[PDB]
Design a protein around this ligand. Sequence first.
Ligand SMILES: [Mn+2]
Ligand SMILES: [Mn+2]
Ligand SMILES: [Mn+2]
Ligand SMILES: [Mn+2]
Ligand SMILES: [Mn+2]
Ligand SMILES: [Mn+2]
Ligand SMILES: [Mn+2]
Ligand SMILES: [Mn+2]
Ligand SMILES: [Mn+2]
Ligand SMILES: [Mn+2]
Ligand SMILES: [Mn+2]
Ligand SMILES: [Mn+2]
Lengths: 315, 313, 313, 313, 315, 315
Amino acid sequence: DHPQPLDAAEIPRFAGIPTFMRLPAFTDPAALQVGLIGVPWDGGTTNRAGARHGPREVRNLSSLMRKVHHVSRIAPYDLVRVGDLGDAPVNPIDLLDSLRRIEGFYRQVHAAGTLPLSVGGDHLVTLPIFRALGRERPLGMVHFDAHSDTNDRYFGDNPYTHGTPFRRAIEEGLLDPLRTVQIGIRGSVYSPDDDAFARECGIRVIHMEEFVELGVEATLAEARRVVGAGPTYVSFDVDVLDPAFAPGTGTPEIGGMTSLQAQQLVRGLRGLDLVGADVVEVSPPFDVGGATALVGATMMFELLCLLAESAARSA
Amino acid sequence: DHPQPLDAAEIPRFAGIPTFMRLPAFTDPAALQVGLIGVPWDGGTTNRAGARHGPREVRNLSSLMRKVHHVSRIAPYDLVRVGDLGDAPVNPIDLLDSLRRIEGFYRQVHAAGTLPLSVGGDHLVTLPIFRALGRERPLGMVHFDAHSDTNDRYFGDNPYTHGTPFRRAIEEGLLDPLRTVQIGIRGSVYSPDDDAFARECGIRVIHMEEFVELGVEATLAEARRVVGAGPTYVSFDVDVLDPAFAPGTGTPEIGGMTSLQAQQLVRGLRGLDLVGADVVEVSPPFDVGGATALVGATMMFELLCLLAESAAR
Amino acid sequence: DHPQPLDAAEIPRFAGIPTFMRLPAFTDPAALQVGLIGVPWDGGTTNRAGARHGPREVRNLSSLMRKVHHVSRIAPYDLVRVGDLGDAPVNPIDLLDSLRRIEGFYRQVHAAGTLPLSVGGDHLVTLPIFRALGRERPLGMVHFDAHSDTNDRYFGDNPYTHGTPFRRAIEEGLLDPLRTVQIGIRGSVYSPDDDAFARECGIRVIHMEEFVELGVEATLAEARRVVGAGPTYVSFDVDVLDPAFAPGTGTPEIGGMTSLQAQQLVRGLRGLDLVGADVVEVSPPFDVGGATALVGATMMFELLCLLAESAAR
Amino acid sequence: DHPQPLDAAEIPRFAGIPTFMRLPAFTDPAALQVGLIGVPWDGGTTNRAGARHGPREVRNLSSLMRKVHHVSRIAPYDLVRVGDLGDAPVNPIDLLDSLRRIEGFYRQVHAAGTLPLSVGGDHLVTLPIFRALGRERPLGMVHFDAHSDTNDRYFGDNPYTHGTPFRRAIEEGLLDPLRTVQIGIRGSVYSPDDDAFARECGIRVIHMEEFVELGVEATLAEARRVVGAGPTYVSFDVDVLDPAFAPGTGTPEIGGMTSLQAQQLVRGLRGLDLVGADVVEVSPPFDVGGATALVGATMMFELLCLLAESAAR
Amino acid sequence: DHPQPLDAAEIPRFAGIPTFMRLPAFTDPAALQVGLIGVPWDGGTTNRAGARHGPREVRNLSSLMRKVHHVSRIAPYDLVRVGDLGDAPVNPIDLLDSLRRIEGFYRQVHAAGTLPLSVGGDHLVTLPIFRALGRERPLGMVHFDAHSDTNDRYFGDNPYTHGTPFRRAIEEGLLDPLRTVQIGIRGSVYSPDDDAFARECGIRVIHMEEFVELGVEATLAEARRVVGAGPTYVSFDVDVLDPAFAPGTGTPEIGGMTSLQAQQLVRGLRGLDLVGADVVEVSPPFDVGGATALVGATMMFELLCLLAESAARSA
Amino acid sequence: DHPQPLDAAEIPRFAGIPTFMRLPAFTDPAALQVGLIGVPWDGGTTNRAGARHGPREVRNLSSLMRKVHHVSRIAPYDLVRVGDLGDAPVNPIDLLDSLRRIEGFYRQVHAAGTLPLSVGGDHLVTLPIFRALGRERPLGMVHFDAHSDTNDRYFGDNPYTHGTPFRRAIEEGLLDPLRTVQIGIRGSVYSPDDDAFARECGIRVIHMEEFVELGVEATLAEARRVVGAGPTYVSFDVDVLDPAFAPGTGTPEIGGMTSLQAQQLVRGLRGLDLVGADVVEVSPPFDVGGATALVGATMMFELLCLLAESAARSA
Ligand SMILES: [Mn+2]
Ligand SMILES: [Mn+2]
Ligand SMILES: [Mn+2]
Ligand SMILES: [Mn+2]
Ligand SMILES: [Mn+2]
Ligand SMILES: [Mn+2]
Ligand SMILES: [Mn+2]
Ligand SMILES: [Mn+2]
Ligand SMILES: [Mn+2]
Ligand SMILES: [Mn+2]
Ligand SMILES: [Mn+2]
Ligand SMILES: [Mn+2]
């Protein structure tokens, strides 16, 4: 009697109210083992905004997802209870207020023992999530991104942008930098002083160039080595992908990962102790016929299958 | 306590699960006095398909709607119980099966005494609705369209298309042709007498040219004259609008009605015995940044205000 | 037996090889009384190019046209022999060569006594057409445009652009300026007297502001007064329309004519001695879901109805 | 010697670095009498953001503008010194900081005696402009909008959004409500009395319905009556236009003003004591082939012609 | 005196009536050795329709194709007689009527000994084609697709959708399942009971994952091994390609084949006994600036070169 | 005191007048060591025009570029003086007049000893550039393209189109064919007589197929071998890339290079004696959300870093 998506043999995929994976909507985190949550918030965006619309369009395109993973044969909704937990509370005018409200929501989700699978929103959304999930013990992370997002300040003394969240997370003791690995980093930078913080912290950084030199299998091996057997969060910024696969994103950088490579890397994360995940920076105003929304919905499903297994083991 | 849309003061319009007008979702028609219903079905389409996606995108853009009509000051959710009844069952592969399923759904809606406000879907969807709502007593209708939709058959012995529903309705005694008025008709025609049926059964047809000659107010008076005080349905085909206002439709014809005009006309229908309405032929695959979906949602809100008064006897 | 478009009762409008109006294709002008011709040429364009693609997309969207005008009840294909004459030869690299080739083609068309209905292409295409059709006796013209297109030269000693064809035509005695009327002119101008030429040679210029003051009917009467009973050409530049109706054009100017207005105006030209017409400046690379291509095809059909009466003496 | 746009006779409109009207760029307000300024800021936006990109795209499309108004025959660059003053400093992350920075910039502009013609940015940008221009003596205003923008607070204790700037302005004594007129207001409203503030402080509000009843000329007379001979600012929110003319905006409402109407209205404001103007809410991420950016550039040119007369005492 | 495309040295590619490859139009199959046919029909579509417009836009974009293949140096129009045979008769309202009418057309094409090179339309179009071409002897097939299209029933007892054609073809004895190989299969499924029919039938299924493990050369070798020297049809569903290359399609699945990989695989089919081919599921309402139309037109040309050689040998 | 881009820590990237890389605008070539120049000219275009708009949209998207290359750590603006030199004079109506005017501009740039980094415009723009830069001594070239652009005549006796420039350049003695290597060539051709001129001239032609067989490293090695230590120009036609990465181009050919591969190949050109470069055939009317403009701006930056080093050594 787990929640199940609308039956596509009966209700065609273009029909029905568009919730994540066409699952039932829930308001109580305790009703679920994995909560699918939107965080429609782009207050942290320094360049092209629009990620506030990401969760709606990912919900929409997630109608194309089916019940069973074709490689792993994981059937997430049979394994555990999955539901659309709605959207976190957000304030488009007041960044500090949104940070507070978002964390408060995730504290409730966490207190119910529910694993969050979240759709942004820009990458600043991951900070208040980590504030909830990393409050008692620090998290490890596999982070897919064109950017490290460990900047310090923007336009004066503003410590909170989509480019600072993991620096903040490390400073706040929420993210363990030795169990952090970043994959796909590329594109022009401000100074040769960017990798300073990463080196100081011991973060493993696999730039696009090194990802290409290693190939998928060896990259994966290095990633799993870094995070080991500890509590691990997966954060997927769609701008890790080449703009050809993910045009709808605020800060594109050419020469990126393919959707195929992203699926292979995420699938190889199976078995880890995964305590949450997100798919961020889908930006519908820059998207093309919902391409990036569909990439987001699909990576969300790939991640759901793995979180279902973790939630199943801990139960 | 009446259903209410999400509070835009606490939940921004880009957020929240996108139901019609961000209202709560309902499975039981008995729960509501006005039922907001999707009919995602375009099996009747003879040219450009895509209206099957219409309800989803109209739902999406209906997030932009607020609580009070700024002219009439009608607050519909306060007046009656409104909600998102979901979508009528549909079958994209079997045309006759869809017809059966939709009618079955609308009979449940009708039996609970709920007035339907529906979003298509192509125009053929109005027939199974009429098979439920006109079953006991025939309907009058204010019909906004570039096309009469009173054709007989297509590509052979095919009697059900988006171009024939109101001929079938008249034949089936569901719709009274003497109480039917069609506004906006225009564009080239297949044969020299396309409207033989319409003239012979007494339908009042206000072509685009005549509506232009008459103007909004006169056009409005003629329409209210035709439907009188009887039970009346309003069917809004977005292709009545010029393609500049409604690009997202299967059968565009240039030289059409403005959105402003559509709003003045529908607003002028206040006070009638409105038993139901629909907005049909929104085709997202042909739409431009959701413009037509927003037109659809807005016309839906205009009609919802009228229907809310009707439901409140 | 007259050429006929594909039967939409047996072949849906999305199907069949896309000729103009889905008519048969012809190589021989002698075969036809009205020749539907593409001039895919934009060598005259000084800003945004792309009108070279216009004829292909207008052909595409002309599939939506049916057999009978719904107002005038003209059935053009029954009246006269109509077909798709293909495209005039063009050279995208050599401007003077294109001018030569197009004129040569149009002289063949003219010598067979066939009336041309042409789709551009930028406005410069009308000149080589006029070099054929106005060779023996000068033309009058009803010209719909945001721009007068009577400039002298561009970027130096360049006398042929989409902005100069009707000055050249007047200079070459192909076009009678006393029988020329231009409707819709608007938008900022290069220099304080852009229309020195026009006022001095006696062209009647109805700016957008005046057309607004006058209205359709008065504007129509003035236009028919100017051209009288003489042989008259109709040249429709889609940029006469507001960008909302015709986004797909090289030189847009806001605050323009509606599609409805364009149709009323052209329809009012019934009964004149029409010797030819064109629809120019459709630029698909700037178009939105084929909106402007459809405007182009539809205006083409409106003009085809008039030309069919003319060809039928 | 007055700044001049690039010569389109020698440099085509698709070429050259894209400054406003292809004018030279300036760092010093003292250099100019009319300053063309970008305010790329949308921190006030409660729904769809993207107006931060507005100035760049309006700059881009302003390349299509020429030197002389074709109706009034005003040649603005000849009358006064005009140029591209660049963009006001902005901070996309810190709302109050942006407010401070923009006001500081506009005080420099004001102190040099330069009249600002600004391109937003969402409507909240007008407040810091008013904090500079209405500092010494209060402004009157002709305000074109679908919305009154006189709300009190959003999502809690937040007093600065694109929906509150003119309430703040009135509260701060920067704007005289008895000399304020708002034209085009329409669309559903949050609560039954959205315009309590407006009626109580004496703002003249011309809803879309009334503007339709009155017509352009009467609407124009009423507006000039309200502002009189006092110092007057003109604020043009592109969402006043129907989405068909201005799709690229954050808060569209259907049934709006045509571009033609917007031009007639602004043109009718000639002769007033105009101390500044802006065009706001152009949102390129929602725009269609730059249509709204071109509307923005064109309305900017219309306003620049008026402001050039004002600056020339 | 074979038909030849409009001469581009004389008539620029944006001009002229847009027939397939700008060839002359034909009404009599007997006039041709290879017939280029549109099947503008998407009655079988269960999700996003629009493939009914595919043949028109593929005709349009096929204007960009030239006369000679740059690798193989095949010049198809010199080798054999090629022409635009127009569109098969279709009924957008009545699926069963379209099936009848389409097969009737292809029976005529087949009776004239003409090899069909067809543009859909959704994949259900391949069924009536096989009903004509496989009527005396069964066909082998190389099938490029994200989906097996061997489903049984949809929404009750409807046996005909774009997802059932090859199951129908096998049941009807038109397609020999031991000489069938499917390449590119990927994406979430309904149950782990999908590959049941394929295993029962002996179809060789090369999922996307296995295509990646093998690489192009070995995949090709396996494909040629399966079909051997027997009569073989090639059916190309553009959704085999990643949405980055083919956005205009009804049922996209991320992480697909590249256009480059598709060209290499098709070229390696040279020499086989190819008796027809199609390019299906181009859906213009979801296409972006005609990208997928051009991919369709180009694969059509790649396939034409190979069919020309087969038609040349059999003559 | 070199010119520097607008400081993004102070002026967000969506703001400020959009010059190349947001640098200051210059009118005097002598003020600069590397000049960034637009050539908004598509008179040579035989098919889909629109490249006349390329320089404007590349300027626009170049706002996303940062100050330092993340691999090479070249900081071009610190190394040498870089500026936006505006656009070359162009005449959209008169091809021969544009050729004259464009060359006259580049003669001035060259006379000041400034290295040009140019954005087209279609590929015919490279001819008048070579007329200026190759006037005293011939140039070598690394040329990335789907097409050789060594055709002879079009539509009669027109020797100047975007498809003839390098034939003209060789005939005029401006380009040394033995130090010319072309990479990415693919797509149907007119006759098997296309590679005639290339073979006669000794041009090294690395077709797409051979690029795939060699891989990036070996291709690069072959390219550097061809041009050796001599004066070398890099000309990058964005249609070398698959339409998935560069949709906005006049003459697309499917199955092309990835943006990632293009970056790797260009980076491997470091150390050569580079005397100019261009990025041509960006066509905004066929572009999708400025994707190709951004690819153009990024390749422009990749090339700038290398030209900065050459300009630094020669100073
Ligand atoms: Mn990130
Ligand atoms: Mn990122
Ligand atoms: Mn209808
Ligand atoms: Mn209709
Ligand atoms: Mn013109
Ligand atoms: Mn014009
Ligand atoms: Mn406003
Ligand atoms: Mn507004
Ligand atoms: Mn398939
Ligand atoms: Mn498939
Ligand atoms: Mn090239
Ligand atoms: Mn090329």
